[PDB]
């Protein structure tokens, strides 16, 4: 009888995913924002470098 | 990783010999293979090479025409065909290994060397200082200079740094002017801003004394310095 | 009465956190990032196509100079290559041809395959003797490998079709930790910038973040609607995305523990067989089995850009290190490098 203690590893499992700290989406998603705008110019997709400066030219 | 040369000897001027490297411990069919003399008590000097399977031969001006390079795959032995052999010919023939491609480091082994006795445009590379005095425990610069640029349009400056160590073979340290050969230790170290080179040792040992080479790889033929000697 | 008010308890416990995760959520990721200024079209071209492979490709990680990479294919080939020069450093012969996926060690010393063989071969590129040969074979998976990557040049992460995650130690060829928790064959892997945790998609639409030093899962996400394909790691490693088969991606927050976007146009019903995020986690791209290759703006899940031109169902995809270039390979045994030009 495998079942009892698949479904006791499954309900430890849960009760180690439900304890913990989450933080709001308000306060998640905008950590998203910071950093793409702190990388923006590093990006040499989102903002091309020049011609000149790409290896693959 | 082994190679073993044979056929020198003492010959006639005008007469012919015939120069065989015997490659093992590697996959000599994947690796470019050289030949570089050493006149006695001078510098090293280019004189010819075969590519990876064959396609590409060079000879140094000095030499083309008159000797011919092959290399057997199968066999793992690489030939140097010598013909109306000179009194300038009689020097200390190396065979060399280098395989090319992206960070590779070429002329990494060097084989013993087999001594041949004959009785009786390219750019130029200075090594300003023949003999430097040291002492274990402090730092020493090895200058090396070149008469062209040696830094490419790609961005990699073709210099190599060669050690000889007295009744040895030439050992590379540095390959492309920074980077450090495996099994060098780390206290050398290269710098060069194209055309001036140097190469420092942070701490001697007894082990670092000989002759120190630099030598370009920018284009054919291959040109080795003077070289500075190291004593204690 | 036991195994019933067990299972009762569990649906309670997941209830409980699925209410959490309702109550921490103020908004979404649309009205926080509704203001901010659009991408724009990203117009990009193909520089170099590194030809040479002669069967599908189904994977290929870039170095971590960004400028070797090594593609796998079903050729039974192993092939780095010179992007900057379109070269071939190496073409190392698999033992087995079903290859799903390849690796490179961030050192560059060592790469990685495995596929149907359950089999994670590593290849040692530098050696004494000149050649590439196999150093370690490593086995206990049961199914088949899906992906695979390095934590040191000699700890390595499998993810296999057997449910289960793995951390191996090269030197020795043993599983040091083995991951459990997954219903469905785990098709992808995307390692922590930080290295220190890594997230795993499966099959049955969930992906699960774990700890390699711990050795058990510690969160899990859902949302998808059939199996979850590819998985990537956003550039600062506090989120990833997921590129399913019902034709969408998602973004999940790893603090916020749940999905922030999704990444779905009703012109597209193929999946997305892989995705890479920009080095500034900007531009999300996702290759579609339609034979193209999106790039999907993050913040704002507005479609700008296509990379058309592939002819086949596009397998991978890999965005340099420094973000310079965005290699994209596909069935047709043809890989395409890629970066904007203004």
Redesign the interface.
Known sequence: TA??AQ??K??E??????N?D?????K??????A??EA??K?????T????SE???? | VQLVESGGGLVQPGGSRKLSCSASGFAFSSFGMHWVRQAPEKGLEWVAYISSGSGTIYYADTVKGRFTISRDDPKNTLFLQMTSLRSEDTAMYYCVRSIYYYGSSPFDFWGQGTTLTVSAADIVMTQATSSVPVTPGESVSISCRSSKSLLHSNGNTYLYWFLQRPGQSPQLLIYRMSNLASGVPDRFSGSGSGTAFTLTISRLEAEDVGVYYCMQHLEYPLTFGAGTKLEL | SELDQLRQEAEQLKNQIRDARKACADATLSQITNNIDPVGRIQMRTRRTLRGHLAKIYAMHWGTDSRLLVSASQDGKLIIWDSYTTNKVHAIPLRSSWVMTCAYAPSGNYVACGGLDNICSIYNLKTREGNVRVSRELAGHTGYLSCCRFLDDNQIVTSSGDTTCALWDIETGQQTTTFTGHTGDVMSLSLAPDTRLFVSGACDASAKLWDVREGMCRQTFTGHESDINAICFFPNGNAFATGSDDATCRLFDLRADQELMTYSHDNIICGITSVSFSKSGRLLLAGYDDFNCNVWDALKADRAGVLAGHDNRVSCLGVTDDGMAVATGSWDSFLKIWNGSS
């Open positions: 079942s009892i479904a006791r499954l309900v499992q849960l009760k180690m995913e439900a913990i989450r933080i709001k989406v308000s998640a998603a905008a950590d998203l924002m950093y793409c990388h923006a590093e990006d040499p997709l989102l091309p470098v020049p011609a790409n290896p693959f030219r």
